[PDB]
């Protein structure tokens, strides 16, 4: 009995049910004997009686067993076998082996070409922004879903809606965030393991797997089964939205879950196997192209930083007073990385530009970095957790990155970021409200957004590994300025 | 016009006026309405009665085939295997438009597997390669075993455009070229341009009777065969191949950062051509090989850069506990040899030398330090040609032909110096010095023995160039050492 108290640990990989848009047979490892079957196998495949204890050869016939045993060699990911002949009827068959069990999934029948056409419309994108923008538009028109979104996962596991294409009558979620808890760890693991997650009907009656628990007390692990049933938590969430069906394409960068291409329909919908194969091929190209553009943007940003710091080094060689040059120059360092403010703290004198803590606050911050830092870059996105008094000015500066200008003096170049809620660009309608089921308003985008805001209260956008690399290049450039100055003075 | 060794550097190999005899070529107007030119062998190969120039493409090829070819041109040349011609027979057709001309190329169809299946099997056998070395090593063995050529080599182009043979799979009776180099002049610029433009270059027969394109000149214009796979071969290269005993070849161009990284060169000692479907597979393999090489290269660069940073960070922590930085460096300098490929390293501080490995003699260092001082703007200075900067350095070029200097001060001419031997000293050539080659009318220039001798002369007194990676690591070392000096001054 899953509810909001235990849905974080719901065993969604072993639900004991499938979705009604196909049927499922579980065989032993050698595909000799039928061990389990979905209750709808008789109806869909035209079979009579309890299929359990019948041979694979009996239930499937000599030909299909021969063909499926061969395909099981290909087994990586599940083998997708569209348009397989049974009675001379056509079934789209998915076949995999996991936990010493052969799972065979059947759909009544109805790729390179569709895939090639989609990939040709994104392969010329030359920015991450351009790729993610055009992808929702392209997937929506090609796969025919009412809404297509892209989420980018944040360092804390929250999702941000970074792209959206939708029917003009729908509310917008663009620029919205949801908390990490909206997608539990087992769901994330399954998104990482499977390219596609299909939900044909959020109000479809689940079909039991017979048996749910076998004679040995083992549940059936449906981790790689596309027909695997959906948490009633998530089904209630979609029903509250008015969503009736979904398909997600997992975006994998550096072997990790970067985000999802989330396709939502406001009526039941399932794509044929051939179209899903195309969507999966599109997903792999999207992921690779995203990873290529992301590397290029990083390289350009690091190179920009180096060229700016080299200009500063050449400039500084012609200056007898380094403190004066920095007082005149420090605001230009704001261009090195995303920040809302920058400041110079040298000889107990403060110079601020943009959104910073007030001069009164800087001694305490300088003191804390001196204590906290081992002479290297020190950075936090949650100043109030380090310095409670920092809560007062969290609206202006919730995040700080500190570059030491000396190992002897408590002098710093300080970068600041606003509370992340202050930089929101949400396209949504705060008047749009949602109906709820027995679990209450927790399972609504409105409440999800409110919960996210509570989790980032008094916090800024985290300092990226790139921001930290740029900060280290700046620390080291400034050491060099100081050294060359002492060499000649 | 006759090509020879004085003008082969500018031979117009894109407009030879001939094709190779393993197919035939029809050139049409941009709309594929009219036949403008044809190879002499079109008559024999396609079974066409009478001169073709002036006829409609539909009259020559039939309405159905021209319809399909028009469609293919609507949807790199188009590779169309097993096309049915008007007389029932199957032809592998290559189709492209260039310089307002449609070029149709024909080969008799055989029996072939789907290219994608062939390509996938090859790709599956290199995709698990986790180093550049493992990829380059296994690729010549795999390609030879798949395509059935007598020799498969990989060349890597050097900074000066020279090729190095970095992988080889061969018949056991053949001479080895592994670890050999050839000078840049062995592949002229227009040949390089065509290796960049075309993934595959096919030579069916290095001694084969050229088939004329009729007419060779139309308006005075020759037929541009830049993208035609049947384009004939320079007499110079055919003579080179005949001298080697090579009768046929196929090269797969390796493209990295939109530049020609190298070739997978397939050589046969008897006339040989692959079917179009196996050539499509070879092209798909080449594309995958290029991408996987780039991924392995990126990981190897990142690992060497991170290894350098980790080592320089250990040194910074170490130095913080040392009152005497000069002494620490005297004790430590040899460890810096581990940052980048080098044959020697030394410390020049306070007119005192300490050397490790292959370095100039102690007496040579003051002249080198003085040179860097006058030539450097207080940043890293590096050369692979010391004697070109300092004539005196020729004396010790065997030991040290290349130097990368890291300045330790802006007010004292103190350096950490890295050295590389003359490149011929680090040669790992698997070849037979007693293997000799017959020659044609152009003489022994067109032989591997003389190619290698010419290369050796182009790099005499020179080392392996310092890579962009080596220079990035040197700059991290310079900066780390500035930081050691500064923190020393802060606390002392
Ligand atoms: C305690 C467990 C909860 C839970 C579980 C599951 N969520 C799953 C998928 C899922 N949930 C959401 C959340 C959203 N928040 C929004 O603000 C919003 C829209 C504006 C959505 C849709 C998302 C985004 C997803 C990802 C799929 C998609 O986008 O379509 C999930 C997996 C379902 C499956 O098996 O396919 C589980 C389990 N959701 C909760 O809210 C909680 C409390
Ligand atoms: C002045 C022009 C010259 C010239 C022209 C061409 N060379 C072409 C191809 C070619 N040439 C070589 C050279 C080699 N040097 C070796 O030492 C060696 C073997 C040990 C070889 C084979 C190479 C490597 C190649 C690349 C193709 C291959 O390796 O199979 C060329 C293009 C031919 C074409 O149309 O396909 C031209 C033109 N070669 C000279 O030596 C000079 C003087
Ligand atoms: Cl749209
Ligand atoms: Cl990103």
Numbering used by the authors:
A (entry chain A): 7 to 81, 85 to 95, 97 to 120, 125 to 503
B (entry chain B): 6 to 80, 86 to 228, 230 to 503
Question: How do the authors describe this structure?
Answer:
We determined the crystal structures of the Pfr state of Y165oCNF and F192oCNF variants with 1.90 and 2.06 Å resolution, respectively. Structural details of the ZZEssa chromophore geometry and rotamer positions of amino acids within the CBP display a very high similarity between the oCNF variants and the WT protein, whereby F192oCNF is virtually indistinguishable from the WT. For the sake of simplicity, we may therefore classify the H-bonds of the protein-bound phenyl substituents on the basis of the EF,tot,HB values as very weak (0–15 MV/cm), weak (15–30 MV/cm), medium (30–45 MV/cm), strong (45–60 MV/cm), and very strong (>60 MV/cm). A strong field increase upon Pr formation is also found for F192pCNF and F192oCNF, which is, however, accompanied by minima in Lumi-F and Meta-F, respectively.
Phytochromes harbor a methine-bridged tetrapyrrole chromophore as a light-sensing unit, which upon light absorption undergoes a photoisomerization at the terminal methine bridge followed by a cascade of structural relaxations.18−21 This reaction sequence interconverts the parent states Pr and Pfr and involves proton translocation, which has been shown to be a prerequisite for the functional secondary structure transition of the tongue, a phytochrome-specific peptide segment. In the present work, we have generated two further variants with ortho-cyanophenylalanine (oCNF) at positions 165 or 192.
